[PDB]
Structures are given as C-alpha cells and as structure tokens.
Amino acid sequence: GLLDGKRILVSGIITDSSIAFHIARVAQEQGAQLVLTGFDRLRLIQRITDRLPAKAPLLELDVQNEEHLASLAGRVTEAIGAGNKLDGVVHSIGFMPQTGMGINPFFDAPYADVSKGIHISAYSYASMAKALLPIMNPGGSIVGMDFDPSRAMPAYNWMTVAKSALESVNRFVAREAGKYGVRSNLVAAGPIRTLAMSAIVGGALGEEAGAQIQLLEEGWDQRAPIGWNMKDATPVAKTVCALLSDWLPATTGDIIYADGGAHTQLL
Amino acid sequence: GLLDGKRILVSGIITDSSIAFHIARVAQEQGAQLVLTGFDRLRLIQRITDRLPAKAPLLELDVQNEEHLASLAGRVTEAIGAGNKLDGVVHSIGFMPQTGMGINPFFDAPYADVSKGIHISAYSYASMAKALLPIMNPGGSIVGMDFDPSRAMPAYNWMTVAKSALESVNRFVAREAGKYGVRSNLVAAGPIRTLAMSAIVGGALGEEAGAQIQLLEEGWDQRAPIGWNMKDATPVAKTVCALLSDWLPATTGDIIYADGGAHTQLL
Amino acid sequence: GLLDGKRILVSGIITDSSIAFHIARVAQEQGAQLVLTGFDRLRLIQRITDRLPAKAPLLELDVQNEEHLASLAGRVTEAIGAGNKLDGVVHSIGFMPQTGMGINPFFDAPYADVSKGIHISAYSYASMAKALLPIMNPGGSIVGMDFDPSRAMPAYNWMTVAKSALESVNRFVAREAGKYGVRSNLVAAGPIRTLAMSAIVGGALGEEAGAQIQLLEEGWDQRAPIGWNMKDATPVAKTVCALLSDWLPATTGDIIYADGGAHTQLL
Amino acid sequence: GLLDGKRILVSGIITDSSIAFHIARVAQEQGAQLVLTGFDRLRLIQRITDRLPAKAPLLELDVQNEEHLASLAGRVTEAIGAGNKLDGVVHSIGFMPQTGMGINPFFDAPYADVSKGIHISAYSYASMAKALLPIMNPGGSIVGMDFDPSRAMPAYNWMTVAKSALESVNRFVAREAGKYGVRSNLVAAGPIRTLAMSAIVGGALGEEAGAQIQLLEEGWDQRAPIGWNMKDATPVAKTVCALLSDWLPATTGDIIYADGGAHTQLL
Numbered sequence A, B, C, D: 001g002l003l004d005g006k007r008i009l010v011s012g013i014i015t016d017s018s019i020a021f022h023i024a025r026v027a028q029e030q031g032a033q034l035v036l037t038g039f040d041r042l043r044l045i046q047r048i049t050d051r052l053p054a055k056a057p058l059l060e061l062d063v064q065n066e067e068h069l070a071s072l073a074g075r076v077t078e079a080i081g082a083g084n085k086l087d088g089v090v091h092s093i094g095f096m097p098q099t100g101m102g103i104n105p106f107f108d109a110p111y112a113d114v115s116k117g118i119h120i121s122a123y124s125y126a127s128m129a130k131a132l133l134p135i136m137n138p139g140g141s142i143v144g145m146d147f148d149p150s151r152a153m154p155a156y157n158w159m160t161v162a163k164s165a166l167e168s169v170n171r172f173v174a175r176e177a178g179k180y181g182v183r184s185n186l187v188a189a190g191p192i193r194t195l196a197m198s199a200i201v202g203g204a205l206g207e208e209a210g211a212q213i214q215l216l217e218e219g220w221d222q223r224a225p226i227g228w229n230m231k232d233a234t235p236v237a238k239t240v241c242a243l244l245s246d247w248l249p250a251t252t253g254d255i256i257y258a259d260g261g262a263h264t265q266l267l
Ligand SMILES: NC(=O)c1ccc[n+]([C@@H]2O[C@H](COP(=O)([O-])OP(=O)(O)OC[C@H]3O[C@@H](n4cnc5c(N)ncnc54)[C@H](O)[C@@H]3O)[C@@H](O)[C@H]2O)c1
Pocket: A011, A012, A013, A014, A015, A017, A018, A019, A020, A038, A039, A061, A062, A063, A064, A091, A092, A093, A094, A095, A120, A145, A146, A147, A188, A189, A190, A191, A192, A193, A194, A196, A197
C-alpha cells in the first residue's frame, strides 16, 4: 500500500461524514498504522471509528487545552510503543462560532468569537506541530486542511480569514519542520457536504447564507474541469495520503488543491 | 492638490518616523483636511503632530476598546462639523508582542499574545471600517498598511501571520464598503526604519533577529528594480494618497505594492 | 492637473471606444502633452483623435515592423522637439487572430496565428520599452494594458495565454526600465465594450463564445464590490493616469487592477 | 508499484542528466509500461535509454513538425497495441535560443528566436495534449515541467516568459482534458544540474549569467526549508509519478512545486 509501515496521527473525526474519517479509512486501506485524536465527545468518536477498516487507539485532544498539548507526545508514544515515532500527522480541525459565519454581518462577529475560531483553525496547526515534531521521523509529513481563502466569498466570512492565517502559519511550520527532515503542507479541498455543511446549506445559519453556499457549491462543480462531487470526500482523502507518502518529497510550506481544478478557472 | 477638499481620518502616529506621520504630512501638502487618532500617549502624539504642515484635531482611539469604537463616529462628526462626512480613512496600526516577533521561537508565542497582535493588526481594520463607514461619503476610500506576507520570512513570525489575516479582512471589508460606494485597499510597503524597526535591527529582540532583518532590508533594495530606501517613507505616503484620491476609482479589496517592485523579482 | 507638464506617448487608438482614446482624453484633461502612435489606418485615427481635447502629433507604428521601431525615438524627438524627452509611455496594443479566440477550439489555433498574437500583445511591450527608454526621463512611467489571465476562461483562449506572457514580460521590462529611473506596470482592466468586444458579444466569433463572454461580463459586475460598468472606460483611463503620475513612485514590475475589485471576490 | 499497469508516454530524454530520464526510470521502477519520444538525435537517445530498468519503444517527435504530431497517436497505438490507450503523458520539453537566455540583453532577443522558444516550451504542451487525448483513458494524467516564473530573475529571461505562457496553456489544456476524464498539471522544479545547466553555470552563455544562476541555485537551497539538491532529479521524478498516479485525482489545471519549498520562503 501507499503508506505501508507508516505510523500516522489523525485528528478531526467527529462523524462518519468528517473529512478526517475518510482520510483515516484511506490511510488504513493503504497500510498505515494510525493513532486517532478526538475532541470532547470521545464516546461518540470511538463508536464512529469502530467502523474504520482497522482498530486504532483514540486519544483526547482539545487544541485549546495546554495540558492536552503538553502531554500529547507522551500519550502518543505510550500508544505506539517506546522507541517508535510518527511518520505522519493530519490536522483536520476547524471551527468558527456562528457569529463569524453565516448571515450574521461580517462586522458583527465579536473578537472573542473570531479569536476562538483562529485559535482552533489556525494557531493549533502550529501547536500540533510543536507537540509532535519531537516524536516525528525524518522523511515525515504534517498535513492540514485548507479552504481556498485567496478571494473573499459570501457567508464563510471569518472562517475564510482563519484559513488565510492557517496558510501563513503553514509556511512558518514548514521552516521548523524542515529542521526534523519533516514536510508541512495543506490540502485545499473543494466544499464537502459534512453534517454541519448540510445543516448550513439547509439554513441553520440563516436562509441567505444557505442559498449563497449552495450557489458556491454549484459554481465549484461548473468551474472544475473534472467536476466536483461535494458528497465524496474520497478524492480529498487520497490527496492527503499522497502528501503523507514518500511521493511528494520536495514539497513543503505549500498548498495542494484537491478541488477538481475549480480554483484554476474563472468560468 | 491631489486631495483638495477631502476630509481624511489618519490613525497610527506615535513618532516622527511613523509611516502615518508621513501619510498625514503628504495628505496635508495635497490639500486634505485631517482628523487624527492616537493610542495611549496623547500628550506625546499632540507634540509630534504640532510639526505637521497644518493643525488637526486629535481623538483618542484604542482599537481594543469597544467604547472608543462605539463613540468614534460621533467624536469625528463633532470634530469635522455636523453634516460633514469623511472622504478617507487611514488605518496605520500594527502590533505584535515580543513573544511573536524576533528570536523567540515561532512555536513559543503564547496564543494570548498572538491574539492581541491579530486583534490590533487585522481585526481592527474591520472594527475601524464598521465605526466609520456610516459617516463616509460615496467615492470614499479606506486604506490599511500591509507587509507582504505571501511567503514566510525570518523574525517577522506572527506579525506575518497577522498580515495574512489583514489581507483576508480587507477583501471582506471591501464587500461592506462597496454598499456605501467606498473602496477598501491595503498598501504593502517595503521595510521602513521607524524607531521600533531601528531598535529591532539594533538587536532589541535578539541579535540573530536583527541580523536577519538587516539582510532582508539589503535584499529588498537589491531586488527592487528602482531600489528601496528604508529611511524614506515618502514614496509609501504618496501611494496611500493615490488610493485616497479619485485616481484609482475601480480598485477595491486589493493590495498596491509600494516596495520598489521588490516582490516582482526573485534576485 | 495630475499630469501637468508631462510628455506622454499614447499608442492603441483605433476607434472612439478604444481604451487608449479615453486614456489620451483623461491625460490631456490632466495637463499632459501627448504624442500618439497609430497602426495601419492613419487617416481614420487622425479623424478620431481630432475629437480629443487637444491637438497631438500622430506617428505611424506597426509593432511588427522593425524599421518603425528603429526610427521611433527619432520620430518622437522630432515631434516633441530636440532636448525634450518623454515622461510617460502607454502601450494599449492587443491582437489575436480569430483562430485563437472565440468558438474555434483552443487546440485548433495554428502556431503562426498564436505567434502573431503573442508578438503584438506581449513581445511588443518589450519592443516599445527598448525603443523609447533612451528618450525617457528619470521618474518616468511605462504602462501596458492587461486582462487578468491568472485563471483560464471560455472564449478568450490564446489572448489569455498572450496576457500571461505580457505579465511576465512586464517584470523583465521593469528590470531594464529601472536603470533609467523608469517604472513599468500594467493595468488589468475589467471587460470593456469596445467596438470589437460588442461585435464578439454579438456573435462575430460564434454564438457560444458571445454567450460565454456576456456571462463573464455579468459575473464581473456581480463580483465587483463597487460594481463594473463595461460601457465606461473612464475608471480604467484614470488608473493609467495614476501610474503615469508621480503618485505611485515605488511601484514597478507590477499590476494594478482597475476591475471594480472583481478579482478579489469569488462570488 | 505506484504506477502498476499504467501505459505512459515520456518525452524529453536527451542525456542521462535529463529530468525525463529520471522520470522514466522512476515510473518503470513503479511498474509503468512506457513509450518514449525523442527529438532529432534518435541514435543517441536509444543508447541513453538502453540504461533504463526496462526496454521501451522509442518514437521520433519534433513538436515543431506538424506531420510528427498528426501521426503520433497512430504510432503510439502501433507501439502499445490496438485496443490499448495511454494512462499518462509526460511533456519534459523546453528550449530557448541563446539570444533569449544568458548575458544577451533581454531587449536583444529577436522575435523569431523568442517565438521558436515559446512554440517548443509552451504551445507544444497543447499540441501534445491535442495529439494524445483521443488515445487516453479516463482517470488519465498529462504532466508538464515548469520553472516558477511568478517573479522575474536574471539570465533566464525569455525562458521565464515561455514558462509564464506554459502555466496559462496548462489551465486551458485542463479544460479540454477534463472532457476525456483526464487531468493536466505542471511540476515546478527547483534548478537541476543537467548537462546544459552545468555548461550555463560554467559560463557557456556568458560569465555574468553563469555567476547569477549559481547565486540563484545557492539561494534556492538556503530558502528551501528541506534544502534543495540541484544534482538530484529523483525528488522531481517522484513528484511527476505522484501526478501520474491515482493519488491526486481532484487536481487539474494546477502546479505542484517540487522545489524544496523554496518558493514559500523569502529568506
Ligand atoms: N467541509 C468543507 O466543506 C471543508 C472544505 C475545506 C476544508 N475543510 C476543513 O477540513 C477540516 C475538517 O473539517 P470537516 O469539514 O471534516 O468538519 P468536521 O466537523 O467533521 O471536523 C472538524 C473537526 O474539528 C474538531 N475540533 C473543533 N474544535 C476542536 C478543538 N478545540 N480541539 C480539537 N478538535 C477540535 C471537531 O471535533 C471536528 O472533529 C477543517 O479544517 C475544515 O475547515 C472543510
């Protein structure tokens, strides 16, 4: 398999529609040995991950919790066995309070809410790299999830701002990761119909925001020369596995677009 | 003059080497009527601004203070006279705690420090636009100060991340400002020898950081096809005035580079 | 005026809807003294330019003609008077054979046609700078016209490829122009309803191409935070004059977008 | 292997230091069945390719020859057997006359020379896709070789302009290739010490050009967070194979940077 013998940490599973669930599934189909991390609802996450092709230890990780971050490398080492290190790290963590996304005006998001969103969605990519680089092998790979923020768009609002910050954070993490012989890259995915996104498109954060995101999804598939299927995270999961593999060994501080090529076309 | 009859708010003056001091001077030489805003050291700022070509009211504005932001439009209206509105707004505000810039490792900046830096340097661009758009005239212009964050660089660290967030914020502010017939743009300046930058290059945030920034400054002038004079903020001030004028009326959500053309050249 | 006392060469006038006609008109309203250049239909161009606010000498220039290029500086000097040099140069020249634009498949444009289009639209920007830099003053400015080619789009086909080459050419021209204290920049305009574009939208190069360009124009105005009026070249002309002025003195090898901010927004 | 059972055409082998020689070697180590194409010196190319891990048919292809292009799909079909189609296409073709690269001034490259360089280096990417798309399988992949032309640089001159045109061509080829379920992407490699590049660095195109390219190579490795080894094309070859594989299935019209991450860092 593509990832035979690799030890990979995968964060971000919350439902069976999580992009990280599909990353974990594909990595296991490709021979990777995984360690999973989960936030807050660990009983739910264990029940979800019982459906993965192979059994994997699940560790708690709230990226806003400094104690969780400080003990993370020790907890991972205990799970993978002393003398073993990770070959890969997947950051598939993102959050923005409802005041920072949807119909709520861009100017009406309080800073405490924007700050929480940037902490979870951007700063934590550096927090995770800091915690895990001392237990990573040379030739290793750190991958985060991006949503192309080069241009503004309706409804995504402060989540787009957080993604612009994440892209910048990734370039600095690459400088640090390079000292360990480790790569740091992001996968910029097209929109995916996760449970939260289906709810948002359904109007959970206002009607106009749902209508605008539905138009964005349609335009994405129209612009993509190979099309874009929002109900299928497998092409995104495969791209993350390509970066975790030994097949992109000279790519770092960079962004790989798994978006059907939509960002390369205007119409 | 370029800005004859225009009413322009200028934030960010702290010393006679502040980029905003030169923006204010050039705007006044060009016939603009100014309102200045200052943070914390108002006695110092008044003494500095006494050296400007013309007298201008000075209002206190701490962008982290919600009360200052809530009363700002009323305080500006009182200063410019009832029935008058602003034609221009200059955001020349930036800050990052020393833990987020310099020799302190990128991974060692606590989030509370990064968050303060992003609040002042990025979020406040939206806070200022929210406060002042209701008192701006159609054809108006909002300008912020940028430092090209497209690629990572030594020492600038979390300030670069904050600038990536500011560029994203600017694109959203442009969407809101457009509803008022107002433009929103950033000027990406080359490095300027302000008092803080001279101190940093002198080793105030560690020797290695000072050495790296000095090399960056030299490389900037070398790459610039027209050269780059870090001791001269006047080309930057002129560029801000070009955006405040009626001469770039179809440019918004954008970045104008006043960097000697250095970002367009590799060597 | 913005361009008081400046001597500026303006190429590219063919009809009263030419972007260059509006650049010439605005530059004259702003106190510039012009020299015009025209291709092939000089009687027509003189009759058109008789409608400009002020009289201006008209010189023949076919950019594919090496003799025209070799004698150009001498012909300009004769027109402006010995001892006088140009302060500005406007390249507003573009062409692509019909095989390289429209419904004709992208793969069906013969190279001789693509090559002619790239010669006129991209290489000539360097040919014009080579011919005129020896007769340009320090502080001078060379401006070319761009159409954002960062992403592919229907119908524009090989014209987009030629614009990608022009943007690259501009960065090299800036290196050469800098030796003379001269800036080189492009203005990336939104779509303008010139006579040829109206004919194209009307189906002159096939129905599907006309339909696609009409959709592009509509989407442009929708995405522009300040809107985009394709029937008005004046905001584009003002932007060219801003670059010809002394108000963007630290910008070179660069692109200024006079597109209503449309390129900064996805939807 | 990564490319088990795939039928891949590889162009561009001229010496054992050709990037295409290493692409061909790695693709064969990964189970691909190859068809090679060669220009002008077919006896030399056969002797070179005798050193590849497996035997592969060699077909003549001068991309400037319309007859070679018109018969190419028929010649490939004869070599791979009737009823078989290609899964992959590698364009590793580049050329610029010496007037367009090196110490010869940028303004001194005659258009006939620039045009030949753009024909071979940019237009031929579309000519090759036109010829081979009718004999490509869905899920297929076309890959071309790029050298980051986003910023101008010394000595590369018109080769950089040709690469800017190639990047634009790639985005249009992706639109056409998508109709066949085929991806089109470029690999932007860091500088490689091929025979021609070693000769250029050695002063074959002037001393100053050699000195500048040597400085560019050094700066590349310095900026790369993981370093850059110009004497090793294997990381570039692996990246091309990643794009030829099924592991980047949602990436098209795009650029993957196999440059040690140097383009993501300023210093
Ligand atoms: N869904 C899309 O359209 C889309 C597109 C591009 C990128 N992405 C990105 O992909 C990633 C995965 O998101 P998803 O769409 O699969 O949604 P998701 O809800 O399935 O996953 C987001 C994850 O973030 C985790 N998380 C939130 N706060 C956390 C905290 N304090 N500590 C640790 N984990 C925390 C959640 O538990 C969840 O597992 C995110 O970075 C997201 O921004 C999503």
